[PDB]
Amino acid sequence: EYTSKEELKKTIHAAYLLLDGEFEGIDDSQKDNRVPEVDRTPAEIIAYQLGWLHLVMGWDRDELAGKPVIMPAPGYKWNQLGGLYQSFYAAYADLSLTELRRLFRDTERQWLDWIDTLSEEDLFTQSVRKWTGDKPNWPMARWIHINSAAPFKTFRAKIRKWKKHQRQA
């Protein structure tokens, strides 16, 4: 849980910067290189974030604009996450690693900008939005956490492990 919008933004941005910082020294040519120890490539690691950040911002933007929201995505049910992730990877597969990092930087800024428009009540009380559902402990802030602060930390571990196994067992 978070104490405030301020702490939420701080935590997200710190984790973003540590994640992106790991990509320094990874060559564009290495973006699709897979090692058995890590389930994702460097390209997939960023494309995964792009996919979820845009999806979640989309839910909120669409709901407020009067576009009914289908979650998680129009052609993917919650039981089809595997396919959803592949659609993320496919959508960004053409971008260089450098281009991916620039898109991720702009997208994380969009994310913080969107959060800045939310009141503390919007963030931390349930049933303000329809898309967050009505379950206790799942207000906007939780959905935001599990799609930014949390995966930015998890996927930082992933890219660090990928880098390790470029050099050693």
Residue numbers in the entry: 16 to 184
Publication excerpt:
The precursor PdDfsB is cleaved by subtilisin to yield biologically active Slf, and the chemical gradients of both proteins between two growing colonies could be accurately modelled. However, remarkably, the dfsB gene is widely distributed across Gram-positive and to some extent Gram-negative bacterial kingdoms (PFAM entry DUF1706). PdDfsB adopts a four-helical bundle core structure that belongs to the DinB structural superfamily. The most strongly conserved region of PdDfsB is the C-terminal helix, which is present within the mature Slf sequence.
A 12-kDa polypeptide was shown to be localised exclusively to this region and is derived from a precursor protein termed DfsB (PdDfsB). To help understand structural changes upon DfsB/Slf conversion, we crystallised recombinant, His-tagged PdDfsB and solved its atomic structure using X-ray crystallography. PdDfsB does not follow this pattern: it is a monomer and lacks the conserved residues responsible for coordinating metal ions. Also uniquely, the C-terminal helix of PdDfsB contains a conserved proline that introduces a kink in the helix. Finally, PdDfsB displays a strong positively charge patch that is, again, absent from other DinB family members. Coupled with the fact that PdDfsB is apparently secreted and processed extracellularly, our structural data suggest that it is not an enzyme. The processing site for subtilisin is highly solvent exposed and found within a flexible loop. Cleavage by subtilisin results in one of the central α-helices being removed, which would force the remaining polypeptide to collapse to a new state, or oligomerise, or bind other hydrophobic surfaces such as a lipid bilayer. The remaining sequence of Slf is shown in Fig. 1e, and it includes many conserved positive charges and aromatic residues. The pattern of conserved positive charge and aromatic positions is reminiscent of cationic antimicrobial peptides, which damage cell membranes.
